Every structure is written in C-alpha cells, then in structure tokens.
Design a protein around this ligand. Structure first.
Ligand SMILES: [Cu+2]
Length: 126
C-alpha cells in the first residue's frame, strides 16, 4: 502493497513512480491533503491509466467539470480513481492487480484542470 501518497497546495505529489508487487492479490492507494486550499482551488484525484489513454481521462475529464469529479462517467481507460478530495480529506482506492498486465506502462495523475502536468507518476508491476 500500500502506498500512501499525498498532494500539497503546490500542485505536486510525492511518489511520482509506484511499484506494485505480484506477490499481492490487490492494491490500495490512500490520498491525503495538507493545506487549507479547498477542493475547488486545489483538489487532488489519484486516477490511473496507461500513457496512451491519459489524454482521454485528462481532456474528457476536464469536460465533465466539478460535480462529475473532473473525471467523466464509466471511463474504460481508468482502472482506478479515488475522488476529488480537498484540504483535510483523505480517501482510498482498493483495486485488483488482475486489472494490470506486466510490460505495460501505467501513469497516474490528478484530472483537475491543469495539475496533470506536475502531478504524474508511473505504475510498473513485479
Ligand atoms: Cu490535483
């Protein structure tokens, strides 16, 4: 596995490169959030996808807007999204690891309006 990742008010993250073990049936991510800069001024998503899909889930996800969770509905290009948290929250995602092959490249990110540039990392498997 579990990671404990957290973003600031800088538009950053920490763990801009994850590694999930194969000797582990599921994976869980926990997002937290640090200063008082609300979920309309700095919210952070932790969405996962492959570095060939991101443009979908960033773009289509900024289309959706706030309420939709800056990440559209269904998106079968996401294997894991937490939700848009903000200052003082925490949330979590407990996904399968079936859902990921090995020898694929997966990037993670925050679909809020422009933080998918400084907030990206990688998820390789194992
Ligand atoms: Cu963000």
């Amino acid at each position: 596995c579990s990671v404990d990742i957290q973003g600031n008010d800088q538009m950053q993250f920490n763990t801009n490169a994850i590694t999930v073990d194969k000797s582990c049936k599921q994976f869980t991510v926990n997002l937290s959030h640090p200063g008082n800069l609300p979920k309309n001024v700095m919210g952070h998503n932790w969405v996962l996808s492959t570095a060939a899909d991101m443009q979908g889930v960033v773009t289509d996800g900024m289309a959706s807007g706030l309420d939709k969770d800056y990440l559209k509905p269904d998106d079968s290009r996401v294997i894991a999204h937490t939700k848009l948290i903000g200052s003082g929250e925490k949330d979590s995602v407990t996904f399968d690891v079936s859902k990921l092959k090995e020898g694929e490249q997966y990037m993670f990110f925050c679909t809020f309006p422009g933080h998918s540039a400084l907030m990206k990392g990688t998820l390789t498997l194992k």
